[PDB]
Amino acid sequence: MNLESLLHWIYVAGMTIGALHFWSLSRNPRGVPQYEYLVAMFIPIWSGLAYMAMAIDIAHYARYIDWMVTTPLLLLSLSWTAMQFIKKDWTLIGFLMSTQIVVITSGLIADLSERDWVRYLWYICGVCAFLIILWGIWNPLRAKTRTQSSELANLYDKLVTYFTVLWIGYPIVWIIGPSGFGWINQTIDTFLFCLLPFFSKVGFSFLDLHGLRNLND
Ligand SMILES: *C\C=C(C)/C=C/C=C(C)/C=C/C1=C(C)CCCC1(C)C
Fold first, then answer.
1. Which protein residue's CA is at the shortest distance from atom 7 of ligand 1?
2. Which domain CATH number covers 216?
3. Domain count of the fold of the chain
4. Which distant-in-sequence residues (6+ apart) come within 8 Å of 210 by Cβ?
5. Is the CB of 177 inside a 6 Å radius of any atom of ligand 1?
6. Between 20 and 30 A from 55 (CA), which of 30, 97, 155, 191?
7. Which domain of life is it from (predicted)?
8. How many angstroms separate the CA atoms of 76 and 39, rounded?
């Protein structure tokens, strides 16, 4: 077992603990609907399975297969919170989810590209779709909370801020690593793509679920 495998196994352990915790919280919902708990559970499970595949075995292909599903689901979770006490705007949710999938597919194509100018154009395409995502969660999605209690609005603002900071790190690590300029080696790249995802998946859902539950103290 090399360092990369070890890092991936620790990540899998993290996902497992996270999943078990959300499952336990769902048994005592405290005012939060089960669908929010189920998505919170599915995300780390899907990611953990993907990383388990890499731990056992372009490089890190499965990481893109993880993001393909988990990123749109994280937006689904974020969207539900924004519309916690109102009717779910499914068209807005679909827009955000599909647009995020474009981010991931653009990233994969870029990584699969043989020509550097082509690779970077697709990277740019992904960043543009990503900017649309940021615009979405900060405007139309954020506006939804303003039609509700200030308590919800304040919770959403903290979550979307946490959400945004972490998400911005992904295109950064990608471009500085082997898929980009190569300022960092694969191992360091892997290490960063273990920490960020842990806080983005388990970390975000922890703050999201506990935040929603706490509003009902
Ligand atoms: C595993 C969980 C999350 C929230 C992963 C998010 C990943 C991204 C936002 C990735 C973005 C990329 C961009 C914007 C540009 C091309 C390369 C990436 C796919 C790394």
1. 170
2. 1.20.1070.10
3. 1
4. 25
5. no
6. 97
7. Bacteria
8. 8
